[PDB]
Amino acid sequence: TMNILFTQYKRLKGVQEDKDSVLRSQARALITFAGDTNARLVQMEVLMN
Amino acid sequence: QADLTDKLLELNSPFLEPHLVRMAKLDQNKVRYMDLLWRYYEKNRNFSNA
């Protein structure tokens, strides 16, 4: 689920800043859902900036 | 004013960063210039300031 998320996120990033923001928001939501979740969320946020 | 935020973000001018900072410090639309400068960071690989 997280991979599909980040893939759609890149699709939207590739309108740009908003796309990346929504991506990081989705990451943080899925993170709080399940720390490896949160670690992956923040690390992806840092990997996309 | 013209709301062409992208081209502004593309401007490679040495006055860009400080002007954005001064605007976000003195204007009443702190949100506007703040978000703008954050994006301006995210573009130039300037991660931490973003």
Q: How many beta carbons lie within 10 A of that of residue A2, not counting itself?
A: 15
Resolution expressed in Å: 4.2
Q: In this complex, do A49 and B47 lie within 8 Å of one another by their Cβ atoms?
A: yes
Determination technique for this PDB entry? cryo-EM
* DSSP string over A1-49: -HHHHHHHHHHHH--HHHHHHHHHHHHHHHHHH--HHHHHHHHHHHHH-
Mutate: best of B39, B41, B45, B48, partner A, most A CBs <10 A: B39
Closest-CA distance, A13 to chain B, in angstroms, reads: 12
The label of the residue with tokens 């689920």 reads A1
* DSSP string over chain B: ----HHHHHH---TTHHHHHHHHHHHSS-HHHHHHHHHHHHHHTT-TTT-
